[PDB]
Amino acid sequence: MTVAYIAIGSNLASPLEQVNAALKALGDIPESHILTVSSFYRTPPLGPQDQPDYLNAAVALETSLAPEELLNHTQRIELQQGRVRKAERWGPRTLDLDIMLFGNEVINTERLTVPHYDMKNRGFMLWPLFEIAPELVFPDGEMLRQILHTRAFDKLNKW
Numbered sequence: 001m002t003v004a005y006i007a008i009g010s011n012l013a014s015p016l017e018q019v020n021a022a023l024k025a026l027g028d029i030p031e032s033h034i035l036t037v038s039s040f041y042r043t044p045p046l047g048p049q050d051q052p053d054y055l056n057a058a059v060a061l062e063t064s065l066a067p068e069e070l071l072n073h074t075q076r077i078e079l080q081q082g083r084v085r086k087a088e089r090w091g092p093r094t095l096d097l098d099i100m101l102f103g104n105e106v107i108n109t110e111r112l113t114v115p116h117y118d119m120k121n122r123g124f125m126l127w128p129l130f131e132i133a134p135e136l137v138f139p140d141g142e143m144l145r146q147i148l149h150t151r152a153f154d155k156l157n158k159w
């Protein structure tokens, strides 16, 4: 078993409903069990700002799936919750499931890059992660607590 950490985001079609539905679906992923769910946070959109606020959260998922097998399921869940691809980069979405970490693994396949390439710069990923895994150490040895102690991130507000 490996513990994967998954970021959840939603800013369309009732984000609270989307995220609660996603938690049920995450539980139904085979060879896998949810260990921990963060609080839900209402976060201002970063990147394009002409969209509704996000609900962001994080979950710890213990799994014996291969990393790309886990991605298969997270993509399936997004699609089954009505995620539609539009032309605009970083457009709003019903559900976004990013694999932040897969144990201590460093993965670089065509479909999957882990750790998530930008997570160390995103409070909306790091704060919910710290809530569920305050002792976390990244594959490069960096400590989550040290990043959050040192780097300026805006305080998150709960949903």
Ligand SMILES: Nc1ncnc2c1ncn2[C@@H]1O[C@H](COP(=O)(O)CP(=O)(O)OP(=O)(O)O)[C@@H](O)[C@H]1O
Pocket: 071, 090, 096, 097, 098, 099, 100, 110, 111, 112, 113, 114, 115, 116, 117, 118
């Ligand atoms: N760690 C990871 N988690 C989820 N998908 C990943 C991933 N690494 C690579 N991908 C790939 O990322 C592709 C595009 O996903 P998108 O959801 O459109 C990017 P996004 O989440 O909107 O922006 P972001 O990656 O800047 O957070 C997926 O089709 C998947 O193959």
Ligand SMILES: N#Cc1ccc(CSc2nc3c(=O)[nH]c(N)nc3[nH]2)cc1
Pocket: 008, 009, 010, 043, 044, 045, 046, 047, 048, 054, 056, 090, 096, 122, 124
């Ligand atoms: N700066 C910056 C920046 C940060 C993230 C992104 C990816 S698109 C995106 N996803 C999210 C998300 O889940 N939450 C919030 N609050 N903003 C987002 N923006 C693009 C640019």
Ligand SMILES: [Ca+2]
Pocket: 026, 027, 028, 029, 030, 031, 032, 033
């Ligand atoms: Ca399961």
Ligand SMILES: [Ca+2]
Pocket: 048, 050, 088
């Ligand atoms: Ca826009």
Ligand SMILES: [Ca+2]
Pocket: 009, 096, 098
């Ligand atoms: Ca994302």
Ligand SMILES: [Ca+2]
Pocket: 096, 097, 098
């Ligand atoms: Ca994504």
Ligand SMILES: [Cl-]
Pocket: 013, 014, 015, 016, 017
């Ligand atoms: Cl809602």
Ligand SMILES: [Cl-]
Pocket: 012, 082, 083, 084, 085, 092, 093, 094, 095
């Ligand atoms: Cl969508």
Ligand SMILES: [Cl-]
Pocket: 115, 138, 139, 140, 141
């Ligand atoms: Cl790392």
